[PDB]
Each structure stands twice: as C-alpha cells, then as structure tokens.
Amino acid sequence: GPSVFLFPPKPKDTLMISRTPEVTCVVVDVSHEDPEVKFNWYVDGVEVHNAKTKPREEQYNSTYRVVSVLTVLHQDWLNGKEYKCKVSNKALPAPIEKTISKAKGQPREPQVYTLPPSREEMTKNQVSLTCLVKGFYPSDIAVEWESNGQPENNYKTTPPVLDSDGSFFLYSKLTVDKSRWQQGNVFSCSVMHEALHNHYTQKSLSL
Amino acid sequence: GPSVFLFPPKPKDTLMISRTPEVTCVVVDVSHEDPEVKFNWYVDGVEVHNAKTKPREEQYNSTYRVVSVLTVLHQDWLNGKEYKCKVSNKALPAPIEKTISKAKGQPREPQVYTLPPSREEMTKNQVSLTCLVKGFYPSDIAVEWESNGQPENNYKTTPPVLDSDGSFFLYSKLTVDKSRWQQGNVFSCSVMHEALHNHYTQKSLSL
Ligand SMILES: *[C@@H]1O[C@H](CO[C@@H]2O[C@@H](C)[C@@H](O)[C@@H](O)[C@@H]2O)[C@@H](O[C@@H]2O[C@H](CO)[C@@H](O[C@@H]3O[C@H](CO[C@H]4O[C@H](CO)[C@@H](O)[C@H](O)[C@@H]4O[C@@H]4O[C@H](CO)[C@@H](O[C@@H]5O[C@H](CO)[C@H](O)[C@H](O)[C@H]5O)[C@H](O)[C@H]4NC(C)=O)[C@@H](O)[C@H](O[C@H]4O[C@H](CO)[C@@H](O)[C@H](O)[C@@H]4O[C@@H]4O[C@H](CO)[C@@H](O)[C@H](O)[C@H]4NC(C)=O)[C@@H]3O)[C@H](O)[C@H]2NC(C)=O)[C@H](O)[C@H]1NC(C)=O
Ligand SMILES: *[C@@H]1O[C@H](CO[C@@H]2O[C@@H](C)[C@@H](O)[C@@H](O)[C@@H]2O)[C@@H](O[C@@H]2O[C@H](CO)[C@@H](O[C@@H]3O[C@H](CO[C@H]4O[C@H](CO)[C@@H](O)[C@H](O)[C@@H]4O[C@@H]4O[C@H](CO)[C@@H](O[C@@H]5O[C@H](CO)[C@H](O)[C@H](O)[C@H]5O)[C@H](O)[C@H]4NC(C)=O)[C@@H](O)[C@H](O[C@H]4O[C@H](CO)[C@@H](O)[C@H](O)[C@@H]4O[C@@H]4O[C@H](CO)[C@@H](O)[C@H](O)[C@H]4NC(C)=O)[C@@H]3O)[C@H](O)[C@H]2NC(C)=O)[C@H](O)[C@H]1NC(C)=O
Numbered sequence A, B: 001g002p003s004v005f006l007f008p009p010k011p012k013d014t015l016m017i018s019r020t021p022e023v024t025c026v027v028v029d030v031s032h033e034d035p036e037v038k039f040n041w042y043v044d045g046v047e048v049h050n051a052k053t054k055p056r057e058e059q060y061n062s063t064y065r066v067v068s069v070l071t072v073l074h075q076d077w078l079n080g081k082e083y084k085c086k087v088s089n090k091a092l093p094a095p096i097e098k099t100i101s102k103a104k105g106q107p108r109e110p111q112v113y114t115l116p117p118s119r120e121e122m123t124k125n126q127v128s129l130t131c132l133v134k135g136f137y138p139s140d141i142a143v144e145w146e147s148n149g150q151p152e153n154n155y156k157t158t159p160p161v162l163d164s165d166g167s168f169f170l171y172s173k174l175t176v177d178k179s180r181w182q183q184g185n186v187f188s189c190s191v192m193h194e195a196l197h198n199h200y201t202q203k204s205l206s207l
Helices: A011-015 A074-078 A119-123 A178-182 B011-015 B074-078 B119-123 B178-182
Strands: A003-007 A022-030 A038-043 A046-048 A064-071 A083-088 A096-100 A111-115 A126-136 A142-147 A150-152 A155-157 A168-177 A187-192 A200-205 B003-007 B022-030 B038-043 B046-048 B064-071 B083-088 B096-100 B111-115 B126-136 B142-147 B155-157 B168-177 B187-192 B200-205
Touching: A003 A083, A003 A096, A011 A074, A011 A142, A011 A187, A022 A083, A022 A096, A038 A064, A064 A083, A111 A187, A111 A200, A111 B119, A119 A126, A119 B111, A126 A142, A126 A178, A126 A187, A126 A200, A126 B126, A126 B168, A142 A155, A142 A168, A168 A178, A168 A187, A168 B126, A168 B168, B003 B083, B003 B096, B011 B074, B011 B142, B011 B187, B022 B083, B038 B064, B064 B083, B111 B187, B111 B200, B119 B126, B126 B142, B126 B178, B126 B187, B126 B200, B142 B155, B142 B168, B168 B178, B168 B187
Parallel strands: none
Antiparallel strands: A003 A022, A022 A064, A038 A046, A038 A083, A083 A096, A111 A126, A126 A168, A142 A150, A142 A187, A155 A168, A187 A200, B003 B022, B022 B064, B038 B046, B038 B083, B083 B096, B111 B126, B126 B168, B142 B187, B155 B168, B187 B200
C-alpha cells in the first residue's frame, strides 16, 4: 500500500521572517488501480484549507508520487503548533495520518565559543578553526562561517548531540590555509537559533 | 514476513585483543505463532558454527525479537572478511541473507588535537575541554577521557563526520568544574583506531 512521509521546515526558514517555511507531505507507492489521493491538513487538530497539492507524478517503478505543501506561519511553528497530514486513498483500509511539530520543551539559548587551532596543528599547510555551540534547545539550528563579509565554504558541522543536561551541542570546523590564519585575518562563526536575540549571533576568531 | 538486520562489532572490541568483538544478526517481525528461527553463519562463504542464539524477547506490538551473536576474530574483521547471516523461518518462502564487513579502503591515522576552554567560557561554573580528532579512515573509532589515570564521566563525543577529503573527523567534549581546570590538573583524550600504533594514542591538556 502507499506510504506517507512528512517533512518539517528548514531551521533557517522559521527563524527569518523574509523566508517562507513549509511542511511537506509526500505520498509514495500510489498504485495505478487506485491513483486518486486526497489530502486533509490540520493545525492543532483544526482543519486548514490553504495547502498546495501537486499533480501526481508517475515514477520509474510504475507507482505514483504525490506532494502537498502547507505554508506555515513562523510564529505558529515556533509556538509549537502541530501539523497533521491526513492522506486518503481507495487502496487503504483507513487514511494514513502523520503529525509533526517542533520538539517539545523549553527553548535554551546557545552558547557560542570559538576555539583557535592547536599549536600542534600549525605544522600543517591547513588549520582547523573550531566553533563550539552548546547548551541549546531544541536541536534545530543553522551554523555558518564567513570572513570579511564573504561566506567561507570549506567547513563541516557535526549533527547536534544530546548533552547530559538535556540540551544539545555541536561543533563546526572551518579549514583554512595556515597563511590566511597567520596573516591575522578575521573569521566569524554565525549561529541561527530561535533562543538567540534576533535569532542570530556571530563570534569572531583571529590571531 | 520477518526482517533481518546485521550489525558490526563495536570499534573498541576489534581494536583490543583482550576484548571480544561480535557480529549481531537481529530478526524482528517474528510471529507469536511458531517464533523459532535458525541461523547459518559464513565467513567469506565458509560456514562457521560458534554462534549463539539469545532468548526470545517479545515486543510491545506482539512480535518477537530474536538475536544471534557470532564472535569474530580481530584480524578477520580488520582484514575485511565478509560475514553472512542466513535466517530461515517457516514464514519465509526462501531464507533471508544479509552480509556485512568493515568499510573498504586504506586506513588513515587520526590526528588528535586538544583545545582548551574559550576565554568567554570561563565565566561559567563548568568549562569545556575539547578533543578534535580528524583525518581518520575508516570511521570506526572510540574516544575516552581520563585524568590522574582515572576515567572521567562527564563527556560526550559527536558521531564521525565525513570531511571533504573523504576522511572522517569528530570532536569530543569533556565538561569539568572550572576549579579543576584552574588548579592545573592534566586531562587526557584517549583515541583508539586501527591506523594508530598499538591502536591507541593519548593527548594531554592542562593550564
Ligand atoms: C518507487 O519510487 C519512489 C520514488 O523514488 C524515485 O524513483 C525511483 C524509480 C528510483 O529511481 C529512486 O531512485 C527515486 O528516488 C520511491 O520513493 C521513496 O520511498 C522511500 C520509502 O520506501 C522514501 O524513503 C524515506 O526517505 C525519507 C527521506 O526522504 C528525503 O530524502 C531523500 C534522500 O535521502 C529524498 O530522496 C526524498 O525525496 C526526501 O527528500 C526530502 O524531500 C522533502 C520534501 O520535499 C524536503 O523537505 C522540504 O524541502 C523544501 C526545499 O526543497 C523546504 O525546505 C521545505 O520546508 C521542506 O519541507 C527535503 O529537503 C528533502 N530532503 C533531502 C535530504 O533531500 C526518510 O526520512 C525516510 O526515513 C524514515 O522512514 C523510514 C521508514 O520508511 C525509517 O526507517 C527511517 O529511519 C526514518 O524513520 C522515521 O524517523 C522517525 C523515527 O523515530 C519518525 O519521525 C518517522 O515516523 C520514521 N518513519 C517511519 C515510516 O516510521 C524514508 O527512508 C523515499 O523518500 C522515497 N523517495 C522519494 C523521491 O519520494 C519508492 O519507495 C519506490 N517504490 C518501490 C516499491 O520501489
Ligand atoms: C514491532 O516492534 C519491533 C520492535 O521495535 C522496537 O521495540 C518496541 C517495544 C517499541 O519500543 C518500538 O517503538 C521499537 O522500535 C520492530 O522492530 C524494529 O524493526 C525495524 C524495522 O522495521 C528496525 O529498524 C531498523 O533499525 C536499524 C537500526 O537498529 C539499531 O538502532 C536502533 C536505534 O534506535 C535500535 O532500536 C535497534 O535495536 C538497533 O540497535 C542496535 O542493535 C545492535 C544489535 O545488538 C547493536 O550492535 C551490537 O551491540 C553490542 C553492544 O555494543 C556489541 O557491541 C555487538 O558487538 C554489536 O554488534 C547496536 O549497538 C545497536 N545500535 C544502537 C544505536 O542502539 C536501522 O539501521 C534500520 O534502518 C534500515 O531500514 C530503514 C528503513 O527505512 C532504512 O531507511 C535504513 O537506511 C536501514 O537500512 C538501510 O538499507 C539501505 C540498503 O542497503 C542502505 O541505504 C542504508 O545504509 C541502510 N542502513 C542505514 C543505517 O541507513 C531500521 O531503521 C528496528 O531496529 C527494530 N527495533 C528493534 C528494537 O529491533 C518491528 O519492526 C515492529 N513490527 C512492525 C510490523 O511494525
């Protein structure tokens, strides 16, 4: 029978009023014999009607995939409203229901600390600039790096890790040529999170 | 029908000859009617006989879970031999086969760097001692902390993260009372990985 997957908005999309956050309800394994698919959408159990549903699209394995997109209000998501997708198809004994929302719990402000390269790493051609982000809740977060107002791209960021006090932490690693670090250039780690003022902070690192 | 999932040994277990690494074949969706299941195990296709089946454990959805554990030899795993679990059950038209082995490729030695707490962090009652481990392959690794020869309890380690050159990195965070750090206690990050001499290195951190 068909399967339903419900996807949350991206962390950045709920934190910036200029962006447009969406919840996305995807149904796969829709058969040819019962290809009609109905979507109902509920917000805290109250039905809403503004979703945009796409025409079904046959896949190379001869099943259909159908997508419904519900735009959410930033403050609704951050207030913890629950979004329910109900998917009806004639091949199903009963409609499939999925629900998604922000992780429950009291938001906690991320603490952002930058850590310079270790002495021992300075023997190499490239060095590691570290951004520790700890004590935050929920785990939805975005982390970026820049220098002189331009985005540094050569970075990797670990997944959030559940810490022992129930908050989350992560590290981001930016790799730069040691000359750039030794020339005294200024590097900034940027963090977006609902519990930060203006949903954003940056912390600077340099020699 | 039932499903079979096959799990590798813990990284520490294969790296230390005193420990006993095992490959684990887990079978779920075993019915309440006739919950017997037979295991065959092969190492590079040669049948072995030292596996043990654990007691059945029924689940909250009225299914059983059945586990078979095969002890493996340290170099067999490290040399990339393939372990095959064959699961036979009356509900199967034909036996299920799953196969597992170590990630393929040239092992690479971890670089281990300890990073002291940020200046900004010293206002807190506890501080974060960081161990960056980068450039290793495969991703199987174990990290521990100690001080004065005894194991520290309050640490967390991120999962390995694929770096842009195809190696892995991670960070480990040890949280200590700021007093212990300011009194100049020496703290050590321990790393176990197959590409290290004696499968082990230690790097120390202090004020
Ligand atoms: C027939 O074909 C179809 C189509 O496949 C395509 O065509 C065929 C012919 C092939 O060529 C194939 O190569 C093609 O891809 C097959 O359809 C697939 O079916 C499987 C299930 O069988 C689906 O698997 C799930 O995938 C989820 C992840 O999906 C995303 O990521 C993958 C990449 O990994 C993408 O391929 C998908 O398209 C999804 O991409 C996401 O799409 C979102 C919606 O558009 C995006 O979000 C939106 O994005 C916009 C911007 O674009 C905005 O930001 C919006 O705000 C935002 O909403 C999102 O960005 C994008 N992500 C990425 C990374 O690109 C998995 O999450 C899921 O795993 C869960 O479920 C498993 C059980 O199935 C479970 O085991 C997992 O652990 C995980 O479990 C969940 O986790 C917790 C558990 O506590 C719970 O919360 C959940 O309840 C739990 N789940 C359950 C069920 O309990 C699945 O693995 C696959 O996605 C789907 N593909 C497509 C393209 O739809 C079909 O299977 C084929 N059939 C047969 C018989 O062969
Ligand atoms: C009825 O219920 C049962 C029971 O469910 C559970 O129990 C009840 C009481 C409820 O509480 C319920 O909510 C619970 O969920 C259901 O049984 C479940 O069945 C599903 C499948 O339907 C299983 O899902 C797979 O899980 C895999 C991971 O499982 C491990 O991790 C989870 C983490 O939550 C644990 O819960 C599991 O127990 C497993 O834990 C591991 O167990 C190992 C064995 O002991 C441990 O290793 C050993 O440990 C010792 C101690 O260290 C020694 O070290 C040994 O030496 C060592 O070997 C291991 O440490 C331990 N890990 C952890 C973290 O604890 C997933 O991998 C798997 O995903 C597969 O399928 C997905 C489907 O979408 C797919 O998306 C995935 O990608 C993945 O397979 C992928 O396949 C493709 C193709 O190759 C690849 O692209 C991918 O790379 C590949 N893998 C990955 C990772 O991408 C499933 O999610 C579930 O595990 C199982 N639960 C249990 C407890 O067994 C049953 O299904 C229900 N029936 C029905 C009809 O609903």
